[PDB]
Amino acid sequence: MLTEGISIQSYDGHTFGALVGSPAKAPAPVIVIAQEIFGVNAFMRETVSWLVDQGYAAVCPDLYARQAPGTALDPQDERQREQAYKLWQAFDMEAGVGDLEAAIRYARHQPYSNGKVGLVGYSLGGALAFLVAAKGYVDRAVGYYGVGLEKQLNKVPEVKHPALFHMGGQDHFVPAPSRQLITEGFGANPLLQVHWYEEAGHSFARTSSSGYVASAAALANERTLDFLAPLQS
Amino acid sequence: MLTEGISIQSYDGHTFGALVGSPAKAPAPVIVIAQEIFGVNAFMRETVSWLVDQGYAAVCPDLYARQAPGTALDPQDERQREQAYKLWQAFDMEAGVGDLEAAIRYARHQPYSNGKVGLVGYSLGGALAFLVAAKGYVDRAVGYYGVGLEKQLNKVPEVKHPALFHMGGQDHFVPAPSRQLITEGFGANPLLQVHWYEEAGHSFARTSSSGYVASAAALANERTLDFLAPLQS
């Protein structure tokens, strides 16, 4: 589900919708939320609603608009899960970064915006979070269980704004050898933080997933909130 | 907010900072952006990011540097609005034209520049846009709701480059007698266009204004982009 009437235009003219929520007290900092491979679905409505509850406005752009606008898939349905993976196969990461840039610019100047913008991404959106952080588009970036961070370690010296990453210690969609590489690579730049959650698997912050761990989700979420707090007026 | 390490020297040796953005495709035409009465603040940033995402480079000089460098005031805050008016009172218009000329001259030869330079100004900057157009510094100029344009009519003949003006028809800074004089005087020079937006008052393109008018904002902005497009390669 996207918010009726919301349209955001990318640098290349492509337009996409978004799910938007904002607290009744404005102005407020705005968090752009980068989706998983499942589109702007229930977990995205959950995440938007949590951030609103915590005094942020939120914008979750339809990053699948180039491929299948309005895609919202249930990761617990087999056939829908398979379709998500196929959409991921074809996902253009450089265009995703560009669409996030457009959503971030949008976020800056809404009537409710206080002018500060953070980004929080999950899985696919966690990798996008790191790419956005290296570009420097946002005041602060957070990625949960980003994929393939070990392939991006060359960009570590580009990160010039605070960024926070949450990784599962039991997430076997990360090759075991990647852990040290990411930890050591990130350890070179004090603006980058990476936390490991030794009991948690992939998608550990999402209740619909079998990797869910409540205590790890709550700790990662507290850290996210504490890290984003400076954006607040 | 200004861009670190950008220092531009003016005709009298006074130096000022600027907020700069360049698009992904360099070189591009550069637009110099003349501020409102609040310094290089959130709306100036919005404008830089907008023009860049439209294919322009953009330079917004700190025109308050002679009085209070790095001034950036929130129009929705009473005390900050009051200080903005006091700065506005002491603002030396001729010096401000000189500073804009310096910015324009600087914009001609940067690695990101295609050699073509336009100017877009708002409020205070909308009057400066007229004065700069009368000097002939720039290739094309645009002013939104310039204040005191009626005092400047003797310069109408001097304008030898195209200039576009977006004026609110309910702008308390442009009471009725003035509107007609401006409409009359500009009518004399085919290079000047002025549009009137009957629903709109001062500041109608700034979303933080109680006077914001989405539909007039959209119309004027689309006209602005059409009018600037000939600078592009």
XYZ file of C-alpha atoms in Angstrom:
466
model
C 0.000 0.000 0.000
C 1.335 3.453 -0.891
C 0.010 6.841 0.187
C -2.460 8.200 -2.368
C -1.200 11.339 -4.077
C 2.503 11.036 -3.171
C 4.827 11.149 -6.231
C 8.597 11.505 -6.184
C 10.690 12.132 -9.253
C 14.153 10.695 -9.747
C 17.017 12.446 -11.544
C 16.274 10.429 -14.683
C 12.603 11.437 -14.752
C 11.220 8.159 -13.417
C 8.485 8.727 -10.852
C 7.525 6.543 -7.923
C 5.134 6.489 -4.982
C 5.797 6.168 -1.266
C 4.226 5.228 1.991
C 4.355 8.325 4.238
C 3.507 8.986 7.901
C 4.332 12.002 10.046
C 3.742 12.821 13.687
C 1.154 15.503 14.532
C 3.863 17.575 16.169
C 5.861 19.324 13.458
C 8.426 20.152 12.392
C 10.139 16.794 12.830
C 13.171 15.017 11.403
C 12.247 12.659 8.564
C 13.555 9.130 8.086
C 13.629 7.651 4.592
C 13.174 3.866 4.887
C 14.817 1.538 2.379
C 12.763 -1.635 1.837
C 13.696 -5.309 1.835
C 13.238 -7.372 -1.340
C 9.518 -7.562 -0.575
C 8.380 -4.060 -1.558
C 6.454 -1.588 0.573
C 4.665 -4.267 2.630
C 3.402 -4.885 6.190
C 6.877 -4.705 7.751
C 7.273 -1.341 6.032
C 3.979 -0.100 7.465
C 5.219 -1.413 10.822
C 8.498 0.460 10.493
C 6.913 3.689 9.360
C 4.470 3.481 12.253
C 7.173 2.768 14.823
C 9.231 5.749 13.736
C 6.173 8.009 13.858
C 5.454 6.687 17.362
C 8.994 7.756 18.262
C 8.555 11.323 16.947
C 9.973 11.014 13.401
C 8.246 11.488 10.107
C 8.886 8.598 7.695
C 8.941 8.136 3.910
C 9.207 4.629 2.401
C 9.669 4.980 -1.335
C 8.567 2.333 -3.837
C 12.031 1.193 -4.945
C 10.426 -1.462 -7.154
C 8.593 1.149 -9.245
C 11.019 0.566 -12.171
C 10.085 -3.131 -12.227
C 6.621 -3.624 -10.742
C 5.180 -0.518 -9.038
C 3.164 -1.192 -5.886
C 4.794 -4.592 -5.259
C 4.028 -5.767 -1.704
C 4.880 -9.413 -1.047
C 4.348 -11.667 1.972
C 7.696 -13.283 2.783
C 5.796 -16.142 4.448
C 4.082 -17.171 1.195
C 6.281 -19.406 -0.952
C 5.243 -18.178 -4.381
C 5.427 -14.545 -3.268
C 8.837 -15.139 -1.690
C 10.110 -16.592 -4.970
C 8.847 -13.553 -6.868
C 10.729 -11.252 -4.440
C 13.977 -13.014 -5.234
C 13.387 -12.639 -8.966
C 12.721 -8.904 -8.509
C 15.987 -8.732 -6.590
C 17.896 -10.479 -9.445
C 16.910 -7.568 -11.717
C 17.252 -4.740 -9.169
C 19.488 -1.885 -10.341
C 21.482 -0.800 -7.247
C 22.770 2.490 -8.773
C 19.215 3.463 -9.733
C 18.022 2.475 -6.212
C 20.571 4.866 -4.714
C 19.291 7.546 -7.108
C 15.686 6.930 -6.096
C 16.685 7.138 -2.433
C 18.483 10.405 -3.162
C 15.212 11.739 -4.638
C 13.240 10.535 -1.609
C 15.767 12.187 0.697
C 15.489 15.531 -1.150
C 11.686 15.192 -0.971
C 11.925 14.498 2.763
C 13.937 17.705 3.421
C 11.298 20.240 2.402
C 7.906 18.846 3.338
C 5.753 21.125 5.530
C 6.444 18.796 8.467
C 10.227 18.550 7.881
C 12.683 20.148 10.315
C 15.356 19.942 7.602
C 17.211 16.906 9.016
C 16.951 13.517 7.244
C 18.048 10.060 8.304
C 17.843 6.791 6.439
C 17.093 3.354 7.860
C 17.351 0.299 5.608
C 16.713 -3.457 5.937
C 18.437 -6.243 4.022
C 18.524 -4.914 0.392
C 17.841 -1.510 1.989
C 20.719 -2.104 4.409
C 23.154 -2.419 1.509
C 21.563 0.658 -0.029
C 21.983 2.417 3.312
C 25.768 1.909 3.157
C 25.918 3.169 -0.464
C 23.892 6.220 0.512
C 26.119 6.837 3.512
C 29.220 6.811 1.259
C 27.474 9.311 -1.031
C 26.763 11.556 1.958
C 23.117 12.306 1.138
C 21.817 11.996 4.686
C 22.675 13.293 8.143
C 22.732 9.741 9.544
C 22.252 6.247 8.073
C 21.317 2.905 9.635
C 21.377 -0.491 7.929
C 19.989 -3.730 9.400
C 21.571 -6.931 7.997
C 22.699 -5.395 4.741
C 23.739 -7.861 2.104
C 27.169 -7.938 0.466
C 28.749 -5.226 2.599
C 32.102 -6.988 2.248
C 32.126 -6.103 -1.460
C 31.885 -2.381 -0.704
C 34.768 -1.947 1.709
C 36.590 0.376 -0.697
C 33.981 3.037 0.109
C 34.746 3.089 3.830
C 36.941 6.193 3.500
C 34.079 7.966 1.714
C 31.760 7.875 4.701
C 31.762 11.372 6.215
C 28.500 11.193 8.179
C 27.533 8.876 11.069
C 26.280 5.416 10.045
C 25.229 2.454 12.139
C 24.901 -1.179 11.053
C 23.295 -4.133 12.854
C 24.423 -7.597 11.846
C 23.283 -11.078 12.921
C 25.999 -13.394 14.271
C 23.929 -16.380 13.134
C 22.992 -14.854 9.723
C 24.132 -17.491 7.258
C 23.334 -15.266 4.325
C 26.660 -13.711 5.276
C 29.646 -15.946 4.419
C 31.514 -16.623 7.659
C 34.765 -15.004 6.375
C 32.878 -11.736 5.608
C 32.434 -10.965 9.317
C 36.092 -10.184 10.068
C 36.452 -8.294 6.788
C 33.474 -6.044 7.540
C 34.401 -5.631 11.226
C 38.042 -4.712 10.469
C 37.187 -2.619 7.386
C 34.533 -0.639 9.265
C 36.771 -0.355 12.310
C 39.002 2.030 10.347
C 36.403 4.848 10.288
C 35.029 6.025 13.607
C 31.880 7.401 11.930
C 30.923 3.792 11.099
C 29.552 1.516 13.804
C 28.786 -2.168 13.385
C 27.149 -4.263 16.065
C 26.881 -8.022 16.028
C 24.007 -9.836 17.669
C 25.432 -13.231 18.419
C 22.144 -15.122 18.788
C 20.323 -13.596 15.809
C 19.959 -14.711 12.151
C 18.831 -12.865 9.014
C 15.898 -10.514 9.216
C 16.132 -10.714 13.029
C 14.141 -7.463 13.503
C 11.093 -8.746 11.557
C 8.499 -10.817 13.493
C 7.270 -12.527 10.301
C 10.675 -14.130 9.821
C 11.965 -17.284 11.493
C 15.206 -15.453 12.318
C 13.298 -13.096 14.602
C 14.809 -12.654 18.044
C 12.914 -10.260 20.283
C 15.744 -9.299 22.593
C 18.156 -8.635 19.705
C 15.492 -6.698 17.812
C 14.816 -4.549 20.909
C 18.539 -3.882 21.445
C 19.167 -3.001 17.782
C 16.072 -0.798 17.826
C 17.121 1.013 21.039
C 20.493 1.680 19.433
C 18.807 2.946 16.278
C 16.626 5.310 18.276
C 19.548 6.547 20.388
C 21.615 7.083 17.214
C 18.814 9.007 15.439
C 17.896 11.191 18.443
C 20.306 14.046 17.533
C 18.213 14.692 14.396
C 15.338 15.777 16.648
C 14.626 19.425 17.420
C 24.714 26.017 5.802
C 27.617 26.738 3.497
C 30.056 24.566 1.593
C 33.364 24.046 3.405
C 36.355 25.755 1.813
C 34.417 27.892 -0.638
C 35.543 31.477 -0.340
C 34.766 34.051 -2.989
C 36.403 37.487 -3.087
C 34.314 40.497 -4.025
C 35.067 43.808 -5.810
C 36.295 45.472 -2.581
C 38.304 42.534 -1.250
C 35.504 41.363 1.055
C 35.225 37.574 0.955
C 32.080 35.441 1.344
C 31.161 31.752 1.526
C 28.557 29.909 -0.540
C 26.540 26.734 -0.608
C 27.496 24.921 -3.829
C 26.058 21.862 -5.601
C 27.009 20.308 -8.960
C 25.042 17.695 -10.940
C 26.394 14.273 -11.965
C 26.815 15.382 -15.576
C 29.449 18.111 -15.636
C 29.934 20.498 -17.115
C 26.553 22.198 -16.705
C 25.177 25.705 -16.699
C 25.464 27.275 -13.209
C 22.687 29.175 -11.494
C 23.652 31.678 -8.833
C 20.918 31.845 -6.216
C 20.113 35.132 -4.458
C 18.778 34.500 -0.951
C 15.708 35.771 0.902
C 16.160 37.806 4.096
C 17.105 34.767 6.195
C 20.628 33.975 4.973
C 21.663 30.692 3.386
C 19.105 28.644 5.266
C 16.928 25.561 4.683
C 15.002 27.004 1.721
C 18.258 28.005 0.003
C 19.442 24.426 0.418
C 16.147 23.199 -1.006
C 16.653 25.454 -4.030
C 20.261 24.308 -4.624
C 19.198 20.656 -4.443
C 16.227 21.294 -6.738
C 18.197 22.968 -9.497
C 20.957 20.311 -9.303
C 18.369 17.554 -9.694
C 17.202 19.446 -12.790
C 20.684 19.445 -14.382
C 22.210 22.720 -13.154
C 25.116 23.534 -10.938
C 24.118 26.006 -8.253
C 25.954 28.514 -6.129
C 24.177 30.366 -3.295
C 26.446 33.111 -1.907
C 26.389 34.238 1.751
C 25.085 37.742 1.003
C 24.905 38.431 4.751
C 28.711 37.985 5.106
C 29.280 41.736 5.386
C 26.923 41.914 8.383
C 26.841 38.473 10.032
C 28.560 35.698 8.118
C 26.898 32.274 8.127
C 23.533 33.742 9.148
C 20.822 31.160 8.772
C 17.460 32.067 10.284
C 14.243 30.112 10.746
C 11.316 32.208 9.371
C 8.934 30.278 11.614
C 10.785 31.411 14.711
C 9.718 34.842 15.980
C 13.055 36.112 17.387
C 14.975 34.842 14.329
C 12.430 36.461 12.012
C 12.859 39.725 13.893
C 16.656 39.572 13.476
C 16.194 38.835 9.730
C 14.290 42.094 9.291
C 17.031 44.052 11.110
C 19.685 42.584 8.822
C 17.428 43.384 5.870
C 17.203 46.996 7.004
C 20.982 47.433 6.984
C 21.505 45.464 3.763
C 23.524 47.444 1.198
C 21.823 46.685 -2.123
C 24.725 47.885 -4.292
C 27.252 45.793 -2.355
C 24.847 42.835 -2.707
C 24.814 43.333 -6.468
C 28.645 43.407 -6.382
C 28.814 40.198 -4.386
C 26.403 38.523 -6.833
C 28.539 39.704 -9.771
C 31.590 38.149 -8.090
C 29.699 34.875 -7.623
C 28.535 34.942 -11.251
C 32.082 35.652 -12.493
C 33.373 32.791 -10.304
C 30.679 30.462 -11.683
C 31.834 31.030 -15.283
C 35.063 29.011 -15.093
C 34.669 26.200 -12.573
C 35.444 22.628 -13.658
C 31.716 21.889 -13.388
C 30.639 24.950 -15.445
C 29.680 25.003 -19.072
C 30.397 28.742 -19.165
C 26.723 29.809 -19.051
C 25.440 31.437 -15.836
C 21.904 32.313 -14.770
C 20.506 33.841 -11.585
C 17.406 33.052 -9.586
C 16.438 35.244 -6.646
C 13.705 35.255 -3.985
C 12.202 38.183 -2.017
C 15.286 40.330 -1.232
C 17.027 38.219 -3.878
C 14.184 38.891 -6.314
C 14.924 42.626 -6.235
C 18.660 41.896 -6.530
C 17.847 39.719 -9.563
C 16.335 42.751 -11.294
C 19.382 44.877 -10.414
C 21.799 42.245 -11.659
C 19.803 41.931 -14.887
C 20.169 45.705 -15.345
C 23.958 45.410 -14.929
C 24.103 42.602 -17.513
C 26.203 40.159 -15.467
C 24.206 37.064 -16.314
C 22.791 35.276 -19.310
C 19.245 35.010 -17.903
C 17.716 36.091 -14.564
C 14.625 35.170 -12.592
C 13.080 36.845 -9.549
C 10.330 35.524 -7.282
C 8.337 38.182 -5.394
C 11.034 40.847 -5.452
C 10.443 43.679 -2.999
C 10.516 47.350 -4.023
C 10.751 46.683 -7.774
C 8.659 49.849 -8.164
C 11.585 51.939 -6.898
C 13.760 50.604 -9.694
C 11.773 51.368 -12.797
C 14.306 53.742 -14.263
C 16.589 50.782 -14.810
C 14.036 49.016 -17.017
C 15.736 50.290 -20.195
C 19.087 48.988 -18.933
C 18.008 45.340 -18.997
C 19.623 43.756 -22.038
C 19.265 40.082 -21.186
C 16.080 38.067 -20.678
C 14.596 38.249 -17.176
C 11.526 36.568 -15.705
C 9.533 37.646 -12.610
C 6.941 35.708 -10.578
C 4.780 37.989 -8.502
C 1.999 37.263 -6.016
C -1.174 39.276 -6.545
C -1.880 39.394 -2.810
C 1.635 40.282 -1.688
C 1.522 42.794 1.156
C 4.964 43.924 0.041
C 3.516 44.872 -3.344
C 0.356 46.893 -2.612
C -1.926 47.701 -5.562
C -0.425 51.020 -6.790
C 2.968 49.293 -7.055
C 1.687 46.274 -8.974
C 0.367 48.500 -11.751
C 3.531 50.603 -11.943
C 5.692 47.479 -12.209
C 3.307 45.942 -14.748
C 3.489 49.232 -16.653
C 7.225 49.860 -16.471
C 8.275 46.308 -17.310
C 5.807 46.346 -20.185
C 8.216 48.781 -21.842
C 10.977 46.183 -22.279
C 10.268 43.035 -24.330
C 13.156 41.266 -22.540
C 11.294 41.460 -19.198
C 8.408 39.103 -18.468
C 6.291 39.225 -15.343
C 3.633 36.737 -14.281
C 1.095 37.441 -11.557
C -0.310 34.761 -9.303
C -3.666 36.000 -8.093
C -4.105 33.496 -5.260
C -0.669 34.166 -3.802
C 1.171 36.545 -1.455
C 4.821 36.829 -0.450
C 6.925 33.734 -0.156
C 4.425 31.589 -2.069
C 7.054 29.048 -3.284
C 8.483 28.372 0.208
C 6.740 25.447 1.946
C 7.648 26.777 5.423
C 5.643 29.958 4.826
C 2.060 30.216 5.992
C 1.788 31.912 2.577
C 2.869 28.798 0.661
C 0.663 28.093 -2.379
C 1.295 24.677 -3.947
C -0.392 25.447 -7.256
C 1.300 28.822 -7.799
C 4.581 27.297 -6.551
C 4.261 24.558 -9.198
C 3.315 26.932 -12.001
C 6.076 29.415 -11.333
C 8.704 26.660 -10.931
C 7.788 24.983 -14.202
C 8.017 28.370 -15.918
C 11.382 28.992 -14.268
C 12.768 25.686 -15.596
C 11.496 26.322 -19.133
C 13.069 29.766 -19.010
C 16.437 28.458 -17.788
C 16.607 25.437 -20.132
C 18.321 27.327 -23.016
C 21.445 27.618 -20.846
C 21.822 23.842 -21.019
C 24.175 22.245 -23.557
